[PDB]
Write a protein that binds this DNA or RNA. Structure first.
Lengths: 50, 48, 82, 63, 176, 120
RNA sequence: GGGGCGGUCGCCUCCUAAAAGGUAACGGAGGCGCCCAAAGGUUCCCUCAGAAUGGUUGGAAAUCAUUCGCAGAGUGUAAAGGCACAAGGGAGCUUGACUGCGAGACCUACAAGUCGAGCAGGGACGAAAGUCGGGCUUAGUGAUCCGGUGGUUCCGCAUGGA
RNA sequence: GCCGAGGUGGUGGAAUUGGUAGACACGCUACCUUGAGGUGGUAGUUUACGGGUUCAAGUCCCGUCCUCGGUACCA
């Protein structure tokens, strides 16, 4: 009630308290956007294991 | 890795069988119906 | 002078397994007796001859043994009665 | 045909923006088209617009 | 429906008296149409198979097969399996419907279109269309297009020599 | 070009797969089935002698049917097979479905012979 | 081919090996101490590699059709033998990767090892015929003693138990 | 020739498969400060090679090249 103005072109990345926003039963392969080759490794799987 | 598997019965509880399986390709407790010579019939067995 | 070089690397060998004919042509042969120990099927089973799990050719019945041929270039064991 | 796998096929009344209609059988029941064959200018011999437009500059001496 | 009647009535007497066959059964017929897809990013893009399992079901409602690689290739980082490419085979009524889609409706939308090649016959009587933009016939919907992956169409006649398949496919309506 | 092999070439191959495991022995003759478009045919063959013992076809101007290619034609020719197999008393027989399924006219033949009294 | 060093010690395949089988050397080559719940069983299906052409990004070579290809491929794995009636490929259904055995054979000093029709009990697949006691055959393993676990109309130091 | 050891930036050199033209200390380059140098401050450059395994390779594996050393002909 009132006014909440926010930047229209800002990319707000949100973190929740509650863990209820997962596309459940999916693999993290299908979940994480891994485009070609090192996008699994150099982007993603290193980021997981590391 | 590959593990030695006993397959105990359910109608009799008797062991009666051994074969091998993976802990990775078969991580769950495996079950088959084999022949129980105490029960003298085909019976569902169970890894123990 | 004795200058040292060693390491043959080729000592070992497997034990000789006795493949080949165990019974002959025109031989009287009882049931269950091994007619031919082989690997693969160098010779096929014919009449009254079974191929085993280690593809040995054994006789199913009593009778004489014949090594005929399977036509083109191929052989065969068959046991006939009397 | 396997049931439950393939999408449907009805008699497509393919239109065109030049008004020419044609009949096929497709996924879409009706298809709107912007350029058909008889609408496309390459099929209609030497076209009006692009052949009248595609004249290279006649070395503009005029003045 | 309409291309069958066109084929029979107009083409079969005209082609029969153009090539002077010794029987009605020697007249060539388009037997099948094979749509190759050739998506080789299944290795590198694990989701990508659904692309053209999505698209080629919409291109022709016969679902294509998720086909597998039959031989391991080390330069492509690929073992036997890891499925590569989709494949439609086509015979029945939808296929004359599909050439009706190609000839009269689609081939205007090739954005650089000219005479598609005379020299695309194998020497036996069969033809392939090599497509570079996957949206040609209006179902493809730019909205639903991100990956531009084109298509190979294999139009397979029953022609014994080659130039009578040429004179078949010119008369059906393929321009050259 | 595109060329296809015949029904008969693949049929003889798919029959020759069948022939490795059953033959027309003594007191189990081989009951063979041929499946023309306009008729259907069935023989009862000794493979030791190379002789067919009994036979029945829908190409019989006696006891004819209208459709001759129907599954009912196959049922009638199967009971004729078993009837000629009853007149010359073999009483026990082995069914050669010849490179086909066990589905339609062949299954109609086989069910008719099992009903009429050939013990497959 | 003195002893030490190096190397080896058991099992499988080829050559040596001399057209049965066998056969040695610190002769020539290689492998093994596993894998597979399908890579087993059965039923039903069916055929490979390459080449020549037509084909975006696709390249010398992915996938596609298209002819020619009774064999280079494939066969979990060395190598031999073998295989397109598949033993090579698919899909369904499955657990015979069963229990008690086993006439008779091969092998062998022994200990062992291998093959086994068939019988009975219970099943799997199949309409049936039938096939199935693991994989395509041969490697993938070790005695006894001593302990553990499970089960048993066995014994149990007088008797009942322990 | 045989055996054993190491082959990274201009340098010396760490890195148990997980992000390095380089992460660490020097050089080097551009600027600043100073009259001009030095010090000091700010920013900046494919792992000997070729072919795999892997979602990922300096690393795991197969081969080639170089250098240190031991082990030889000869002086």
């Amino acid at each position: 009630e009132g006014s909440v103005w926010v930047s229209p072109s800002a990319n707000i990345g949100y973190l929740t308290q509650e863990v209820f926003d997962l596309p459940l039963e999916q693999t993290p392969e299908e979940l994480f956007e891994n485009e070609t080759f090192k996008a699994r490794g150099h982007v993603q799987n290193l980021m997981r294991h590391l | 890795m590959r593990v030695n598997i006993t397959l105990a019965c359910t109608e009799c509880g008797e062991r009666n069988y051994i074969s091998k399986k993976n802990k990775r390709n078969n991580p769950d407790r495996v079950e088959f119906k084999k022949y129980c010579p105490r029960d003298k019939k085909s019976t569902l067995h169970r890894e123990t | 002078s004795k200058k040292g070089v060693g390491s043959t690397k080729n000592g070992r060998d497997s034990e000789a397994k006795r493949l080949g004919a165990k019974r002959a042509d025109g031989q009287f042969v009882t049931g269950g007796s091994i007619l031919y120990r082989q690997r693969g099927t160098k010779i096929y089973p014919g009449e009254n001859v079974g191929r085993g799990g280690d593809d040995t050719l054994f006789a199913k019945i009593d009778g004489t043994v014949k090594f005929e041929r399977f036509g083109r270039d191929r052989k065969k064991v068959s046991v006939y009665p009397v | 045909m396997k049931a439950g796998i393939h999408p449907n096929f009805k008699k497509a009344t393919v239109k065109c923006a030049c008004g020419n209609e044609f009949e096929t059988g497709s996924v879409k029941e009706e298809v709107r088209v912007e350029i058909c064959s008889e609408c496309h200018p390459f099929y209609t011999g030497r076209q009006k617009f692009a052949s009248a437009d595609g004249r290279v500059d006649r070395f503009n001496k005029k003045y | 429906n309409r291309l069958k009647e066109k084929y029979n009535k107009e083409i079969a007497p005209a082609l029969m008296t153009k090539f002077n066959y010794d029987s009605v059964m020697q007249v060539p017929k388009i037997e099948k149409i094979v749509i190759n897809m050739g998506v080789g990013d299944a290795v590198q893009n694990a989701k990508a198979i659904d692309s053209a399992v999505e698209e080629l079901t919409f291109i022709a409602g016969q679902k294509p097969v998720v086909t597998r690689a039959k031989k391991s290739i080390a330069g492509f980082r690929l073992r036997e399996g890891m499925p590569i490419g989709a494949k439609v085979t086509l015979r029945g009524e939808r296929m004359y419907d599909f050439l009706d889609k190609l000839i009269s409706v689609s081939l205007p939308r090739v954005r650089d279109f000219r005479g598609v090649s005379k020299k695309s016959f194998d020497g036996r009587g069969n033809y392939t269309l090599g497509i570079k933009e996957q949206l040609i016939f209006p179902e493809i919907d730019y909205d639903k297009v991100t990956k531009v992956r084109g298509m190979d169409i294999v139009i397979v006649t029953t022609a014994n020599t080659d130039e009578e398949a040429r004179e078949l496919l010119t008369q059906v309506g393929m321009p050259f | 070009m595109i060329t296809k092999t015949s029904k008969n070439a693949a049929r003889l191959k798919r029959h020759a797969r069948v022939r490795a495991k059953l033959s027309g022995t003594a007191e189990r003759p081989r009951l063979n089935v041929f499946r023309s478009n306009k008729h259907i045919y069935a023989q009862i063959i000794d493979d030791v002698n190379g002789v067919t013992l009994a036979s029945a076809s829908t190409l019989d101007k006696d006891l004819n049917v209208e459709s001759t290619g129907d599954t009912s034609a196959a049922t009638k020719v199967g009971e004729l097979v078993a009837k000629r197999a009853a007149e010359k008393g073999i009483s026990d027989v082995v069914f050669d479905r010849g490179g086909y399924l066990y589905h339609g006219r062949v299954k109609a033949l086989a069910d008719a012979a099992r009903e009429a009294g050939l013990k497959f």
